[PDB]
Each structure stands twice: as C-alpha cells, then as structure tokens.
Amino acid sequence: AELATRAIPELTKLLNDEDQVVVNKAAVMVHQLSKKEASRHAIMRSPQMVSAIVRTMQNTNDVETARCTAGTLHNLSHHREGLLAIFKSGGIPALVKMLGSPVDSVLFYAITTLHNLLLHQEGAKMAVRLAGGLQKMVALLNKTNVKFLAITTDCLQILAYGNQESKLIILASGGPQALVNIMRTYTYEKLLWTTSRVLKVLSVCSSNKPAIVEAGGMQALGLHLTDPSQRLVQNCLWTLRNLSDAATKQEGMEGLLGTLVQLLGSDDINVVTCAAGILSNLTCNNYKNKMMVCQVGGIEALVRTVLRAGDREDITEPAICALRHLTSRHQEAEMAQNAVRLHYGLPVVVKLLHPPSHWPLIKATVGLIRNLALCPANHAPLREQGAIPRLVQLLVRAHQDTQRFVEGVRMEEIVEGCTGALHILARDVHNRIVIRGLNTIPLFVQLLYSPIENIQRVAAGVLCELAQDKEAAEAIEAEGATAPLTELLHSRNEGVATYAAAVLFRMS
C-alpha cells in the first residue's frame, strides 16, 4: 500500500491521458499495476482510476491499448469491490461493446469480467440485459476456444435462468442452433455440461423447444448419453425429456432410441425415469420409432423396468405408456404383445390396476391391456391373472362418479378404456362367460346412452361380441337395448352405427 494507497493519486493522473499515445503508454503501465496485488488493491480502493480505465478502454481504437485495459478490469474482477468498481464505472455496457471486438485476447478478459460480475455482483444480470450483451454472447458462440465457449455459455445460463424474456432473446438470436452445434462438435466436458444447462433452461419454454428440436437437439444430446460424466448425461436426459413431445417428426433417432433402452437397465433412478419418459413420448404416433425400440429388445427392457420399479409410479407410468405404444399401430406389434407375456409381464400389468396405483397409472395400464388382448395367446393368461373382474370394478365405479377430474384423469376416460379392454377380451368365449357372469350387460346398455361417441362405440362393440352367444343375446334384448341401438344406427361415428347394426341382427 506504500506504493499504492499513496500511489493512487499519482496514478489517477497517470490513468487519464489526452494523447492517443500517452494513455497507451499509461494503459500498459496500469496493466503492470494490475498484475501486482498491492497496486490493484489500490485500484479497487479509489473509484476515479476505475472509471478512467473503463472510459479509455471504450475510446481506444488500438488493440494493445484495449487489451491491457481489459486485463486490468480482469484483475479487478478477482476482487469483490473491483466488481463494485466496474459497476460504478459503468463498464458492463463497455464490456458488452467488446463482445463484438475481433481480437481474441480482449474477448477473453471481457467475457470473464462479465462472468465474475454476473456471479458475485448484485443486479449485474439486469445490466447485461439492458446493454444487449445477451445478443452479443450468442454471436460469440461461433468462436472455437473451448475455455472461452465454456464461460460464454455459463453467462447465458445465469442470464436465462428464471427469465422468460432472456430465453426469447436467445431464441431470436439463433441461440438454439448455436448451442446444438456446440453439442455436436466439441468433446470438452465443462463446455458440453454448461451448454446442456442452457438447453435445459431453454427446454421448458414453449417457443424455444420446437427450435431446439428443429436444430437437431434430440440427436445432438443423444451423442453424450454414453459419457462417463454423470452430470452431463443427467442434464442431457432432463433436456431430452422436455423436448421429446415435440420430436415426433424427427428422424435419425436410431442411435438415441438404442441408448435409451440400455439406460433403462441403469441403476440411477433418475436415469431410468428419464429414459422411460423419453421413450414413451418418442414412441407415440411414430410407427418407425416403435419398430426400432422393439428391434433393440425394448419390450423386454421395459418389462424388466416395470418389475424393478414396483410401487414407484414415476417409473411405471411412462414405462407402461411406452409399452402400450409398442403394442399397437405398428408392424411387429403382434410380436410385442406376445413379448410382454414371454417376459412374465402379464402378472405385473394386472397388479398395477389395483391399489396403491394412482389414476394416471391405471389409465395407461388399462390401455396396455386392450393392446395385449389383441393377441389371442394373451386371452387366457389375462383371464387367469384376474384382469376381467378388476376392469369391471373400475368401470362400474368410474361410471357412478360420472353420473353423480380425479388425479387429472376424467372418469369418462376410465369408462372408455375399461369398456374398450373388455371389448377385445370378449373375443374369447371364456372371457364372455366371465363378463356375462359379472352382470355387466345392464351397465353396457346404459353406456349406449352416454354422450361420448367413443363410449357408445366400445359399449356397442362389447355387446356385439357378447350377442354372438344365444343366452346373452336374449339378455341384451331384455335389457331394452334394442331401442338405443336404433338411434345408434344413425350416428355420425361409423363404428357406433355398425356395432349397433350387428347386435340388432344377433337378436332374432
């Protein structure tokens, strides 16, 4: 401090210079005063010099002058008050101006001083946003030095987190495409982890997610699912899960779907839950993805996941959902319906219909059972496992709650799913004796009166399969169903009209 606190007032005169060359020879001096801790603890001390370093750094059109001036601000950036000094000096907009400077060396001090400001200085995020540094940081994502890219992506992550307007600026600045490029072309873990944190923050925005998917983000995140760094894989999985609802049109997912299946066998419950969630979303409405997941043993992996998950519905509900997807509207679905039985899946699926399962899990499980029931080899084991009495009790109770949303599930979807499962199970003659013995024919006739056209179709279809037996056909008639079936014959839904025409013919 000798040649410091006391060396301060002379340095204020040595900072401010009017000559385009004496302030240059002064700036390279101030850099030397920045390299010594004693002299920079004096630069931190008085705010006059700090404003002059910031001013002359804006004024200078010489690269070397701008470097030592920024390196000075960098050395002040290690000190807590140095930050407060740059905050007073208004250097944040000045530092932003050099995010467009070309020489690398000055970019590296500026993005670091801004980084330390965003971490330890209060209100710094608001100042960088006002200065338009967000758009300058996204443009910097094209540079090549990985240590520089790791700091820039972190600055964007601290700024975008919890701020929806910062996320929309990153979108408008082409951020999604730039961040995805970083994931495809670099192997440095610190940068890839930070970039995935940015994409994770952008993944929850309704506008950013389609653009990330458009840029190939699903495939880019898939490349790092095999990485030994847990924080990288986990953030990739969290990000993949948020975008997976918008990626039903993407192709080239063969590698991702194969890795996702292996991740189901993982011991990390967060890894397993995410992989089950992504696979469930990507297999929806995508026949090609259904084929691939089945081609890499996905049914067997999902059945093992549901067995290992037990009572945790964070795992079973997506894994059941994915299983219901892979068992319908898809080429090798008949082999998938059998595969569930072959891997001892039928007992656990029926179990998930009983407590303590919550209604969302029950919805998927009933849907899974309809698809499994399409395979005749599943008719007898589903009956032996006790599926028909339980589906009937769920249907009866759900129908009373409709006459008089639970867990986000409307009971009318329980009514429709349970009647649909019974519709397919009723193809087997022994299931029809069980369904008939439960005195379900009444309730089925009531469902013909239901306003939901899908509930009318499953109700008329199950009565149609039942009406092929003589004893049952008389019971449907005695139930008075001949009159609703007449109004059903003239329905906008075909399926409602044809099933009503079939039962009517069966009653003779």
Side-chain angles (χ1 to χ4, degrees), residues 1 4-5 7 9 12 15-24 26-28 30-32 34-35 37-248 250-253 255-287 289-334 336-403 405-409 411-435 437-469 472-486 488-489 491 493-508:
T5 300
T12 80
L15 225 332
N16 252 323
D17 310 298
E18 187 74 9
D19 177 51
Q20 62 291 338
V21 198
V22 187
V23 73
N24 189 157
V28 291
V30 176
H31 196 164
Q32 306 330 98
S34 86
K35 285 331 210 142
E37 160 82 350
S39 47
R40 74 165 88 127
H41 226 309
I43 304 321
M44 154 262 172
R45 254 287 329 281
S46 156
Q48 186 32 293
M49 62 228 54
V50 197
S51 78
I53 302 132
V54 163
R55 286 175 259 133
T56 58
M57 197 216 105
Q58 223 281 358
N59 314 144
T60 174
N61 285 78
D62 165 86
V63 153
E64 184 85 316
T65 321
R67 156 173 313 122
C68 43
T69 321
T72 319
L73 294 171
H74 184 352
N75 284 258
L76 276 313
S77 206
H78 312 126
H79 269 166
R80 163 133 168 277
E81 161 102 358
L83 273 1
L84 164 152
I86 318 150
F87 220 63
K88 177 262 145 193
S89 315
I92 289 189
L95 288 130
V96 166
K97 117 204 130 243
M98 308 261 93
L99 267 19
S101 86
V103 67
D104 268 21
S105 91
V106 195
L107 288 164
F108 298 13
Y109 314 134
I111 202 52
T112 309
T113 308
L114 289 164
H115 194 231
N116 303 326
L117 272 173
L118 291 179
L119 288 139
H120 328 300
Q121 184 75 28
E122 311 83 10
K125 317 200 202 141
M126 183 186 279
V128 189
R129 293 188 190 101
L130 291 183
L134 268 174
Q135 302 86 314
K136 299 312 111 153
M137 292 183 191
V138 173
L140 284 183
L141 295 177
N142 69 351
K143 253 73 200 212
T144 44
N145 171 273
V146 313
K147 287 154 305 163
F148 159 87
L149 273 191
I151 273 158
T152 302
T153 51
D154 205 49
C155 288
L156 292 164
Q157 198 268 345
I158 317 188
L159 282 153
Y161 179 72
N163 206 339
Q164 188 57 229
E165 69 172 17
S166 295
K167 298 164 185 220
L168 294 171
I169 298 166
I170 295 171
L171 183 54
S173 302
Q177 190 60 263
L179 301 164
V180 169
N181 294 345
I182 281 171
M183 300 299 283
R184 307 194 270 213
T185 63
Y186 291 84
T187 206
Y188 186 53
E189 191 264 348
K190 238 275 173 174
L191 163 67
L192 293 169
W193 174 65
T194 307
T195 313
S196 80
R197 300 186 74 219
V198 191
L199 293 164
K200 190 198 137 112
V201 175
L202 299 192
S203 69
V204 297
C205 166
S206 62
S207 304
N208 266 276
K209 161 204 317 179
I212 298 169
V213 174
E214 265 331 297
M218 302 295 301
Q219 302 86 343
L221 301 162
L223 317 167
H224 306 296
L225 287 182
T226 198
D227 190 294
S229 159
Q230 273 327 107
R231 51 184 207 170
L232 187 41
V233 196
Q234 201 32 258
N235 282 266
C236 287
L237 283 170
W238 282 327
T239 310
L240 282 162
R241 180 173 58 180
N242 307 312
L243 325 170
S244 57
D245 42 88
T248 36
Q250 288 302 317
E251 304 233 353
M253 325 276 276
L256 173 75
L257 298 165
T259 321
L260 288 168
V261 168
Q262 309 179 342
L263 289 200
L264 295 163
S266 134
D267 264 342
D268 198 358
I269 205 179
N270 279 292
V271 161
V272 165
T273 302
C274 284
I278 303 149
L279 285 162
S280 161
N281 283 3
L282 297 205
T283 50
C284 182
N285 298 339
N286 196 310
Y287 77 109
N289 295 351
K290 295 161 156 109
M291 254 156 267
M292 300 204 246
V293 175
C294 290
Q295 273 195 156
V296 282
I299 295 269
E300 192 200 349
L302 279 177
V303 175
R304 207 191 315 292
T305 306
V306 178
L307 283 165
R308 213 224 74 210
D311 42 287
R312 279 106 65 184
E313 329 199 28
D314 283 355
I315 317 162
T316 49
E317 190 224 82
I320 293 303
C321 282
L323 276 170
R324 159 201 56 181
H325 295 161
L326 310 161
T327 47
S328 79
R329 323 287 158 282
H330 143 66
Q331 225 173 58
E332 57 215 88
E334 260 269 337
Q337 300 153 358
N338 282 283
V340 170
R341 184 190 64 257
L342 299 192
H343 304 305
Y344 318 92
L346 295 196
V348 77
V349 170
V350 174
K351 164 194 89 112
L352 295 171
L353 297 170
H354 296 83
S357 297
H358 296 60
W359 286 115
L361 178 56
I362 311 279
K363 205 219 278 145
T365 305
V366 172
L368 181 42
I369 292 200
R370 319 162 100 211
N371 293 351
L372 301 178
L374 303 155
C375 170
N378 287 332
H379 292 173
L382 283 173
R383 177 200 326 123
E384 298 148 15
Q385 283 329 284
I388 299 176
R390 181 58 178 144
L391 289 164
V392 166
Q393 300 280 3
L394 284 164
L395 165 67
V396 179
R397 195 44 197 198
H399 176 70
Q400 324 193 353
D401 306 335
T402 295
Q403 283 327 290
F405 69 109
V406 196
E407 324 211 76
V409 190
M411 273 326 105
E412 303 73 313
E413 327 177 310
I414 306 304
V415 171
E416 181 192 349
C418 290
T419 311
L422 292 167
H423 179 199
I424 300 136
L425 287 165
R427 296 191 204 160
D428 172 275
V429 317
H430 294 295
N431 299 335
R432 268 182 261 117
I433 98 215
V434 179
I435 292 152
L438 268 279
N439 207 50
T440 52
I441 274 165
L443 196 143
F444 288 144
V445 175
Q446 268 91 322
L447 301 190
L448 301 169
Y449 292 88
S450 153
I452 281 74
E453 283 150 20
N454 292 319
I455 291 183
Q456 297 156 26
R457 187 197 90 99
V458 288
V462 64
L463 290 164
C464 171
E465 300 270 13
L466 287 160
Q468 77 182 124
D469 310 300
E474 316 169 2
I476 297 120
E477 199 175 321
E479 213 47 56
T482 109
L485 286 191
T486 319
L488 266 11
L489 248 65
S491 156
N493 253 23
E494 199 282 12
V496 166
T498 311
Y499 288 140
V503 189
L504 280 184
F505 166 78
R506 280 134 156 85
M507 331 195 263
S508 301

